[PDB]
Amino acid sequence: GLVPRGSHMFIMIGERINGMFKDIREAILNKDPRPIQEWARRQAEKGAHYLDVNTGPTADDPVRVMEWLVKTIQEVVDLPCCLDSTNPDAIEAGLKVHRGHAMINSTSADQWKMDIFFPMAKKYEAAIIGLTMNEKGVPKDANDRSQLAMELVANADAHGIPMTELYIDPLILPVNVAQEHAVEVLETIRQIKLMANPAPRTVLGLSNVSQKCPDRPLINRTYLVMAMTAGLDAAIMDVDDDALVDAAATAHILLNKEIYCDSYLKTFRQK
């Protein structure tokens, strides 16, 4: 049921160095390491366990862009990177220059993607996010999402990837246009936690639940709490949002995964 079997700390993956944001896009254009390194530091300070790294749209060679991002981040910060790209060569390139164990974001449930990405994760000893979806699209029901989760689990195992290295992403969509999905995603999280011992982990790009909605911060933090209750292990999230991190810390306590103390908000942040 909802009593968590594990005590593992919740994994916060800072979402902010992503070329979708103008300041990151322009730093990449100008090859200016300053905005990159500032955001790496700010997120580290706020307590991120990993830093997401996404080139964004570029006409530049994604391989060079990724190597660059990864090295300039890890120069000023000791944190592993969550390498976020649809380009396997870009991912492998970041992995070759990465210090420590990385996370790969992501592979789909498409067979040819699994076939490429899983070997990469084993070879480099990286964690890997599988998304529940394939070229037929992202499913609606929890039952259809769970079916793709099982397929991801099977392939991961067959490539010799430990379940503690595998993070399944149910794909949260915005509540305004997508509303009915948010509860199906919650149930999928619950089901994934059942699929093996030890169980696969679970992750969400969290901010997607609110994209283009009126009070983003309130919706984001409400849903993170719901997802954590359902069994969520990790989120790509804005770690710069103090209210959001406050909510996660409070939920982690109420879940009995860390011993309560009056200082728990501060303690949660230092891990």
Added chain:
Amino acid sequence: GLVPRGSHMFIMIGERINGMFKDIREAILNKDPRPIQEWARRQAEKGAHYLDVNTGPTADDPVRVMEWLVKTIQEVVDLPCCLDSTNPDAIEAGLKVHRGHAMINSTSADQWKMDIFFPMAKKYEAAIIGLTMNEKGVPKDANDRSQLAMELVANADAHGIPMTELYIDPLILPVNVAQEHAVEVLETIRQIKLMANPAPRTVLGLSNVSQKCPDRPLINRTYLVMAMTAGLDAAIMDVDDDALVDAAATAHILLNKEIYCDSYLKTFRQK
């Protein structure tokens, strides 16, 4: 699983007219209807579906106190009362003067209490809260709480009480002294929702999760969201806390129990 079978609006029971609070205690002493009527109005305005009514400690006759509270409330407000007392004569007295259908708070799983209170609820057509506990104390595990829930369900049914009239209370305790209970309560909520068709409802005195803890509002609203995810139907709560009601409204939307709109915070409040 976590996809709710029903669309019912979340039931907010205003906690504030309770003799534990000095201003209420003194209004009762002086027989001053003003503070009572102000709090009835404020809570109604904030969107409460019921108003909790608790005499608090008194050397006065609880029967007279209760009749008085109930009449002075319902004079200025059209809302039903949730009659909160350990004294069955006080409860029956409020029920005789009550306009509309009341709620009784509460009976324990003690046989002699069930034997007294259930007939009262059927006779007066009142909803009734059962608490999961008896003279052996409040159980620790969800499994032990659920066992008392089943016993409450059985007695309610045997008295001809519909499950839609029955609200089972798992008994939340403060996270500072009680921390391990909060997750057991969540699992109990989940289990209760399984025990019949239609299912019994569930309720928490919510503010108990934070009593004598440092940031009460944050802990209260985090846990309400978790409990709603688990299937919570109703809470005795501070409806005057706008952040708390904002959180519940957001969770209700994310649960798909009401159709999303940009105005949903306001819409949730008008029911």
